[PDB]
Amino acid sequence: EIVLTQSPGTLSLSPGERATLSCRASQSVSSSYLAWYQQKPGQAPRLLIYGASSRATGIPDRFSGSGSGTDFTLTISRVEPEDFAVYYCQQYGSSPWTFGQGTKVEIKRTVAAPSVFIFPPSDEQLKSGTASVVCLLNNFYPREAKVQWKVDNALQSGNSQESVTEQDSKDSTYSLSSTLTLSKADYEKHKVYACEVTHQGLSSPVTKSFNRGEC
Amino acid sequence: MQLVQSGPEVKKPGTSVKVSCKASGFTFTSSAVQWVRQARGQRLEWIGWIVVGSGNTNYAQKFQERVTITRDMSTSTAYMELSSLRSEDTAVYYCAAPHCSSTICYDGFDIWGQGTMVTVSSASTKGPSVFPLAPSSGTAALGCLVKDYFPEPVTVSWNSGALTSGVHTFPAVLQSSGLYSLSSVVTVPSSSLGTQTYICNVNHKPSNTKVDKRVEPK
Amino acid sequence: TNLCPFGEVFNATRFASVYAWNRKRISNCVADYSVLYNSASFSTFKCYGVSPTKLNDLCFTNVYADSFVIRGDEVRQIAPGQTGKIADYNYKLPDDFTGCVIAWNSNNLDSKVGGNYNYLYRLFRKSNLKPFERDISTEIYQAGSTPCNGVEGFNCYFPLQSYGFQPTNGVGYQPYRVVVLSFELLHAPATVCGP
Ligand SMILES: *[C@@H]1O[C@H](CO)[C@@H](O[C@@H]2O[C@H](CO)[C@@H](O)[C@H](O)[C@H]2NC(C)=O)[C@H](O)[C@H]1NC(C)=O
């Protein structure tokens, strides 16, 4: 099986800058069968480049591609905002026609601190029998962000789960939700519930907490 | 021109699923069709391919014994059938082909299908329960937590679509129960917290569940 | 005054694939064609230009006997003016054909449980055959701009495909054996005559 390693894992560029993504193979591959595709979240791939060099009909002059042997590159001369997406390289000369891991082309702006809020369990969820408390990191950059749960002031793992949005097209920020779900009986075993978020846009780790049953 | 695929499918483990690729606007007889799949947020994976004229197939060893690629030229469509479905097989399945004229074919896969979402889980269909998240006592935020549902597609809107600025609906996560939960939030000016009121509406098409809940600060 | 060796052609143990159809030239013998028309063993016996019983009083310099196996649904293409994968890419009779097409079911000899895959036909070719041409090439078919250099793959297809006859096939998919008799006359040495 031909392995395809893509580099870098993700590069971040201000619009109009130069983009250079690379695809490297475990052994030499025919340049006649190597392709690059641009995929945006939710959508199907668009063919960008075929035969390692030739541009797909209707794709803008922005995109170009070259390489041979084991090294291939795709170059975006001036990345218009429509070009921020995932890029996958696929060889199709030798079966199986494997793919690369893909490189993510995100848009780069100045560091922005998260706007972290904490939501205690809804009144009726306790009636239902469980208790979910959510922590919301809002409108930050970069994606890297560490959320630590402290129940009663103590580090908690095992019932946290987080999810991150796509980059907002306007202000180029991510937002993350980390939900902590326990049972009502487990929920009533502790007093103070806290969310401790670490971010590069923060001098000190910001912790937002509440005491159970008071507002 | 285009490639159109079947609907979305949800199947219990160990069964089969067969999705289709109808070609329009190019001489289908002379092209080839390749099937790939992609886990949500992961890389693309090559399943196999087929030569439209001859029906000969090639499969990755991962699926050699479980996948069957066929085509009916009469209706000019292709089919991928996956039997003995594993849980990890849940993904969006894409089908691609090179557009061809009477005389020559394209040297790359340019035509792509829209994708078919295929979910493999023992979990039976369940509607979601919606739980408010009220603002904390110069701007504030609120939302609703849509939890314990299956399968994935859920629509969420605010004030029947009137409020759209600053709304973030996170992609859902799959909890160990095998059901899904997501949360949808929005930020408003703190000044407007008392004058304006916010209700969220969720449609879960699979279970025919339309639920609205209010978010009232306290 | 020796008899024509039809048993060599009709009762041959092995028959050719259509892309490589085999033809035996038969000359300097006496042919009785009415025994064939009344053989009753043939599901197809269609003559063009000449009449089947009427020409048993005729003479020719040489008669050619071309033979091959196809599926039943394709026997109709072995006739003047027809189209399809066989007439276009494998064996084409001319518009001005003078001769006969003879066919019979061969499921009991050429089918095998699990499929007999030795019999092939040409699926890919850049141009249609001219009448009575035989293409035995196995060059990979280039369906795109990229040369194939003898390696099968994307846009690079091996040109021959197998019929895969199985005995439980429906009649249109079971194999039929075909003999085409062509009647040649030139400069009149008159070597093959009726009784
Ligand atoms: C090919 O072989 C067959 C069978 O051996 C011949 O068919 C005739 O079959 C009947 C069956 O009752 C016999 O009585 C005849 O004697 C057979 N013919 C002869 C000439 O012996 C057939 O004639 C052979 N030759 C062909 C078809 O050209």
Q: What residue has token string 């391919």?
A: B49
Q: A115-211 has which fold?
A: Immunoglobulin-like (2.60.40)
Residues 6+ apart with CB under 8 A from C124: B53, B54, C89, C141, C143, C157, C159
Looking at beta carbons, which pairs linking C134-138 to residues 24 or more positions away fall under 8 Å?
A: C134/C19, C134/C20, C134/C21, C134/C23, C134/C91, C135/C19, C135/C89, C135/C90, C136/C19, C136/C20
8 A C-beta contact, residue A23 and residue A2: no
Is residue A200 less than 8 Å (CB to CB) from chain C? no
Per DSSP, A126 falls in state: H
8 A C-beta contact, residue B93 and residue B35: yes
8 A C-beta contact, residue B28 and residue B76: yes
Domains and CATH numbers, chain B: 2-120 (2.60.40.10), 129-215 (2.60.40.10)
- The overall longest dimension of chain C from CA atoms, in Å, is 59
Is residue C127 less than 8 Å (CB to CB) from chain B? no
Closest alpha carbon to C74 in C88, C62, C57, C55: C88
Helices (H), C15-152: 34-37, 85-89, 107-110
8 A C-beta contact, residue B48 and residue B65: no
CB atoms within 10 A of CB A193: 25
| Phi, psi dihedrals of residue C87, rounded to the nearest 5° | -60, -35
**Residue to substitute in C10, C15, C29, C104 for testing ligand 1 pocket (most ligand atoms within 8 angstroms of CB):** C10
Per DSSP, B58 falls in state: E
CB atoms within 10 A of CB C8: 11
* Conformational region of residue A172, where left means phi above 0, alpha means psi within -120 to 50, and beta covers everything else: left
Q: How many angstroms separate the Cα of B10 from the Cα of each of A115, B119, C5, C186?
A: 38, 5, 66, 73
Q: How many angstroms separate the Cα of B124 from the Cα of each of A14, B154, B204?
A: 46, 16, 14
3-state secondary structure of B105: strand
The secondary structure of A29-55, three-state, reads: CCCCCEEEEEECCCCCCEEEEECCCEE
Alpha-carbon distance of B153 to A25, in angstroms, equals 37
Q: How many CA atoms within 13 Å lie on the side-chain side of C140?
A: 15
AA identity, residue C29? C
Is residue A93 less than 8 Å (CB to CB) from chain C? yes
Alpha-carbon distance of B79 to B22, in angstroms, equals 9
Alpha-carbon distance of A89 to A39, in angstroms, equals 11
Per DSSP, C169 falls in state: S
Q: How many angstroms separate the Cα of B32 from the Cα of each of A88, A91, B45, C149?
A: 20, 16, 18, 19
Contacts of C155 in chain B (CB under 8 A): 32, 98, 105, 107
Residues 6+ apart with CB under 8 A from A96: A1, A2, B46, B58, B60, B61
A44–B115 CB contact, under 8 Å = yes
Q: Is the CB of C165 under 6 A from ligand 1?
A: no
Q: What residue has token string 């021959």?
A: C160
AA identity, residue C137? S
Residue B116 Cα, gap to closest chain C Cα (Å): 24
Per DSSP, C35 falls in state: H
B54–C143 CB contact, under 8 Å = no
**Residue to substitute in C6, C9, C11 for testing ligand 1 pocket (most ligand atoms within 8 angstroms of CB):** C11
* Bond prior to A8 in cis (omega within 30° of 0): yes
Question: How many A from CA of A190 to the centre of ligand 1?
Answer: 100
> For chain A, which residues make up each domain, given as ranges?
4-107, 115-211
AA identity, residue A115? S
A44–B131 CB contact, under 8 Å = no
Alpha-carbon distance of C39 to C102, in angstroms, equals 11
8 A C-beta contact, residue C99 and residue C180: yes
Per DSSP, C56 falls in state: G
3-state secondary structure of C49: coil
Beta-sheet strands, E only, within chain C: 22-26, 29-30, 44-48, 59-60, 62-71, 99-105, 120-122, 141-142, 156-157, 160-162, 175-184, 192-193
3-state secondary structure of B190: helix
Q: How was this structure determined?
A: X-ray
Q: Is the CB of C7 under 6 A from ligand 1?
A: yes
Question: How many A from CA of C42 to the centre of ligand 1?
Answer: 13
Q: Please report which helix (H) or strand (E) contains residue B18, including its range.
A: strand B17-24
What token pair was written down for B103? 């005389």
Contacts of A4 in chain B (CB under 8 A): none
Cross-strand partners of A139? none
The secondary structure of A142-202, three-state, reads: CCCCEEEEEECCEEECCCEEEEECCCCCCCCCEEEEEEEEEEHHHHCCCCEEEEEEECCCC
Q: Please report which helix (H) or strand (E) contains residue A123, including its range.
A: helix A123-128
Alpha-carbon distance of C120 to C138, in angstroms, equals 12
Per DSSP, B170 falls in state: P
What token pair was written down for C180? 């085409």
Alpha-carbon distance of A132 to A77, in angstroms, equals 47
Q: Is the CB of C13 under 6 A from ligand 1?
A: no
Question: How many A from CA of C178 to the centre of ligand 1?
Answer: 18
3-state secondary structure of C190: coil
Please, what's the b/e burial string for B25-42 (b: 16 or more CB within 10 A of its CB; e: otherwise)?
A: ebebebbbbbbbbbeeee
Q: Please report which helix (H) or strand (E) contains residue A67, including its range.
A: strand A63-68
**CA angle, corner B58, sides to B52 and B62, nearest 5?**
140
Q: What residue has token string 């006592």?
A: B137
Residue B105 Cα, gap to closest chain C Cα (Å): 5
Closest alpha carbon to B22 in B110, B100, B89, B111: B111
8 A C-beta contact, residue A70 and residue A52: no
Q: Which atom of ligand 1 is nearest to the CA of C11?
A: 1
3-state secondary structure of C36: helix
8 A C-beta contact, residue A159 and residue A76: no
Query: What's the CATH superfamily of A4-107?
Result: Immunoglobulins (2.60.40.10)
Torsion sign (Cα): B52, B54, B55, B57: negative
Q: Please report which helix (H) or strand (E) contains residue B46, including its range.
A: strand B44-51
Q: What residue has token string 């899904």?
A: B180
Rg (CA), chain C: 18
3-state secondary structure of A114: coil
Closest alpha carbon to A99 in B69, C144, B96, B71: B96
8 A C-beta contact, residue A183 and residue A197: no
